[model samples]
Target chain A: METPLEKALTTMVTTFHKYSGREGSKLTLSRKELKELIKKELCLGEMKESSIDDLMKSLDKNSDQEIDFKEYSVFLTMLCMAYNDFFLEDNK
Target chain B: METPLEKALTTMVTTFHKYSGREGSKLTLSRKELKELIKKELCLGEMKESSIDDLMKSLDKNSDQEIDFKEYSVFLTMLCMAYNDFFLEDNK
Candidate 1:
């Protein structure tokens, strides 16, 4: 709990719920919720509507059209990798 | 950067480098680095040596015995999923 990684993990969970609970099931992120999350919480910034629709399509693995915790975790992993890739290239 | 999720993603990348740079490639986590990360940063609490050995084996996708950022992101995703599971059950 005292570690940065621990705190980051907590933030990941809390942040997901912060958006996911705003509409539809409190347990998942609707398409709108996911879009809102990306716009406000990510560096992606004002992504095109079609891009979000495509993202939603990719993340909703079970065809539920919602991002569950598992789906969100996958999304986070992608974001981290993207961030890490830039960090690596920048430092190189 | 004001968003918690944005901050969390930054933390994940930085924390990985903090440990990964301590030894070996300076870009990946050696077994020792990964072990130290889990023991100190995670709530898992003094995991058995054998458990860590198993973990390293599981994470070393390239069989290089070092955890790269991609592999590390997968591990982080697992941790977030575990945390989210408990959070979900607690709320239920």
Candidate 2:
């Protein structure tokens, strides 16, 4: 049986694949494509074009025009970082 | 500019709407409907009917036949709890 932790890891990887527009064997992501992925999967609201650029800048990290797996992993980390606040609140 | 924390909160709310059957208006959910949403959004594995029932029980909390926003919020919390195990690990 897969542990809950393992399941979560799988979820992250699977989700990355789902949102990144990759199937069994495809790879590419433009800034617009990445922004749309973030909007759809992460549900960032009506983000302005500037915010999209900002997001791209954050994900680019090293300012490369393209992102590799390392950069993609950092993007995932940023996603969790971006959404943690809601789950941590003391709602009454 | 929205604080990163506020952005995260908005993300959760917006995601819930995207996954749930609600758009600008309208609200309804059956066990099957909710299960589909969980599979898509939270990316649960091929869950059996029993697991679905277990999930329903978890969300039901009060043994109600339907779920309200409070129940839905707790459901979202569970999603984060399930996934946090992955993000917390030190991947090298």
Candidate 3:
């Protein structure tokens, strides 16, 4: 909506579509899709294959080529956590 | 603190701490604090004692009668679904 409840959720969804929908299935993010998403939106530039693979190895919901809305949501929260901890360490 | 989008979720972070910082644990939401949060933030208005008990029944972590940031994030998304639907419909 106009507020916090879905603002983050909306960002997570739209960010997926902004890239994922541009290439193939409007519903999933391919490796390239994941690549573009991370390189651009997040400062965690150029994730190592193992880094991406590490997450994907366990996240394979129903497809091998791409991840869907649910998985993408998980990934964003993962990134948010990474950032939180990165900053949290600085604070502590 | 910057970015159009980050502002959206920082409110969420501050909100969590705003109330979670009160009363008992500084990093978690106790049931009474959670009740205050839901009623004030969501305008859910005087949540019945049972409704509050139910979400806690499901969301409580480690039987501490409290929900922390990680548990809070999961619960937040579940809240987003109904939020997304209602707002998306106002458009359709």
Candidate 4:
């Protein structure tokens, strides 16, 4: 019986695998690949291409085009925080 | 103006709305409704209906039939942690 957290983890890994592709036994994401991955993962719809770029810039935080693991981790943490806030607002 | 975190948060909220039907100006989720919501939001495939039941049992945490907002919040936090671990393992 898989836990909900485990299921969530598996889904994230599967998603990364789909985008990063399998290189023998390794998965790597270059800056360009990461950008594309983020765009697909986060974009709402075909609203406007500018929204994607705008989101990337906002996530960049420090105005750098390249996002390393540290930055990515922080971005994810923020995502969790935002979700909590949204939930609280809805419940209230 | 929206960041990746914002987008992620928005997605979560949107998903909650889709599941928890609007009641005038409020949103409500009963235990049965929440169970259905979790099944749709988190379950993988039609592998075995037992798997969904198993997952619900696992996420139940305290073995309670009903999950309140506190349980829901903790569940989402665990989801974030799971995603982080998966991402770290893939990168490493």
> What proportion of the true contacts does each candidate reproduce?
0.59, 0.00, 0.12, 0.04
The CAPRI classification for model 2 reads as: incorrect
lDDT of 4 by residue, A3-80 (tens): 443454344445556655454322344455555555566543354343444545564444424433333434444434
Worst 10 residues of 3 chain A by lDDT: A83-92
Candidates' RMSD to native: 5.0, 12.6, 6.1, 9.2
- By DockQ, the candidates rank as 1, 3, 4, 2
- Model 2: lDDT equals 0.44
TM-score of chain A of 4: 0.52
**TM-score for chain A in each prediction:** 0.60, 0.50, 0.60, 0.52
lDDT, candidates in the order shown = 0.59, 0.44, 0.52, 0.46
Off by over 4 Å in 4: A1-92, B22-27, B45-55, B58-70, B79-85, B90-92
Docking verdict class for candidate 3: incorrect
Comparing candidate 3 with candidate 4, which one achieves the higher lDDT?
3
**lDDT tens digits, residue span B1-92, model 4:** 25333444444445556655443321445555556665566644544345345445675554424444434434554444434443444554
Choose the strongest candidate by DockQ.
Answer: 1
Q: Per-residue lDDT tens digits of candidate 1, residues A8-88? A: 767766777788766545567665566566556665644323544456555444453666665565566655554344455
Q: Kindly indicate the candidate among 1 and 2 with the higher DockQ.
A: 1
State the iRMSD of every prediction, in order shown. 2.8, 12.6, 4.3, 7.7
Candidate 2: stretches off by over 4 Å: A19-28, A46-53, A57-64, A87-92, B1-92
lDDT of 2 by residue, A7-32 (tens): 43344345545544453222334444
DockQ of each: 0.48, 0.03, 0.22, 0.08
How would the docking of model 1 be graded? acceptable
